[PDB]
Symmetry: C3
Subunit: 185 residues, 3 copies
């Protein structure tokens, strides 16, 4: 029925810090091709608190494209957890947030329900791979990773996560999954 | 000149039983895209006799496609050997048959000349790979296998069989050979 | 700024002899698709002298294409070094030449500046890989090799040479780099 559910629960938001490189996106006009230019990169601030409200900043940037004439690009997002977070814990049962475009002290609400679908920790308890998506299989979906490239082994595991989460098999193939160019970055 | 000839002769029709998964087809409108949906599968009845007439039933099925809105699909074929078969042998010099669409006790002739071009046996004398085709290089052609996927090693061997059979090199590349989606089946 | 410069200097023109197979070209209408048909092949005469003028003949050929109806094709080029060459040396600091179409004792000037961008020698001091290109990143560019295919390892090294020479990253991906069909030749 296309309803996607979260796979990775009881996530530690303190670990939600550092740089992640976009590996692939789906073809939602909300994020594609705008957020899928070459060398696309996401820096996460890690948890900040505004009382019982938890949130995280994301700095997006990507490189120019000579053959397409596109200049380089950068913008900032804020992810606000929809459920209050206790001031005694940095762990949420599921990561469900609203997303804002931010500039200076201005913010504009983009979407009320962005989820961390899947999250994998390496052997040092740092995030290796993150998948972000909506509540339906045709809403924006992004695969990002700690390194610019992943082995084929790894990529097929990440695609299998989307299947287990409820994405239909015919959506898990091009032109509905598109890989981001990370060469020469 | 595009005339294709059979490579694999003296075939045992008793071994023509079990399930085979479609790996690739050519682009003949007779079979593509109708018989090339995801998870396409062929069950062979193995030899049946109607006097000196030999034949085999094939149950086709494939899975639905959400993004294309296609429902799942299934139909039945009958392959009738064109040459009489002696009641004392299950082996033909070449497998040359007419193909019918079948439903209940009704049948409709589709094509008078379908051949087994290539057939490979594993070390237990079971069929591992089958290629079915016509008498010309632009007539329907199907590659099927005992498993859902084959190694690259193996796939290049099967493509080389089509070259040895008379298929022109420029037909052995996309968009003239198309691979079937066998993931998540 | 798209200006490409030569990487490989102090090249020995005596070694510029033998057969090379085209691996990929860019999409310049000057050479694509004309010089990129299947089984495309280049025979180099090795250095000839006309006084202090050095030059080399190149015989191009490629195979027919049944599905496209194209007949086989062959033609001859002459590469004339633009700088005089001393009669005591077979080595140039850079290989910069004009290119002519040749037939019988007739010649027609095609382009005044064709360069050897990159050249790699194997362990026997023979050319293994050659990249030929212009003075801008959107002028014709051809990758050729001593064998019909190269390992992925090797191909990524050759693409990295074009980046170091000044080709923009967004030009080093399809549809701006196109691979030549070398199967069944
Ligand atoms: C999973 O989803 C998202 N993930 C991210 C990162 C955390 C990886 C950012 C954004 C979305 C998103 C979801 N729904 C919408 S609308 C929108 N805007 C794009 C920026 C714009 O200025 C140009 N098109 C205006 C529209 N972004 N998103
Ligand atoms: C090698 O060839 C074939 N192999 C097979 C299997 C044994 C793998 C089946 C069928 C052909 C075939 C050859 N010539 C035609 S016409 C046709 N029909 C498709 C079913 C239809 O109901 C929808 N298009 C009506 C038309 N099938 N074939
Ligand atoms: C690197 O560049 C080239 N390398 C080669 C080989 C040494 C690999 C040959 C040619 C060029 C080239 C450069 N600028 C032009 S124009 C042209 N002609 C193609 C033949 C034609 O008869 C049909 N289109 C008339 C036009 N070839 N070239
Ligand atoms: Cl940039
Ligand atoms: Cl670029
Ligand atoms: Cl949105
Ligand atoms: Cl990996
Ligand atoms: Cl892609
Ligand atoms: Cl189904
Ligand atoms: Cl599906
Ligand atoms: Cl038919
Ligand atoms: Cl295999
Ligand atoms: Cl394909
Ligand atoms: Cl030929
Ligand atoms: Cl051909
Ligand atoms: Cl030119
Ligand atoms: Cl190699
Ligand atoms: Cl290509």
């Amino acid at each position: 029925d296309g309803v996607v559910h979260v796979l990775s629960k009881n996530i530690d938001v303190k670990n939600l810090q550092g740089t992640f490189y976009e590996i692939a996106t789906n073809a939602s006009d909300k994020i594609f091709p705008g957020l899928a230019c070459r060398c696309t990169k996401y820096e996460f601030s890690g948890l900040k608190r505004d009382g019982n409200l938890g949130y995280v900043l994301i700095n997006f940037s990507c490189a120019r494209n000579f053959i397409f004439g596109e200049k380089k690009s950068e913008m900032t997002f804020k992810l606000i957890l929809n459920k209050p977070l206790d001031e005694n814990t940095t762990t949420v049962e599921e990561f469900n947030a609203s997303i804002y475009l931010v500039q200076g002290n201005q913010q504009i609400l983009l979407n009320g329900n962005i989820n961390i679908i899947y999250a994998e920790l390496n052997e040092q308890n740092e995030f290796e791979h993150l998948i972000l998506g909506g509540q339906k299989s045709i809403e924006p979906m992004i695969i990002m990773s700690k390194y610019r490239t992943v082995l084929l082994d790894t990529y097929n595991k990440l695609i299998n996560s989307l299947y287990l989460a409820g994405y239909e098999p015919s959506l898990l193939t091009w032109p509905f999954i598109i890989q981001t160019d990370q060469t020469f970055c």
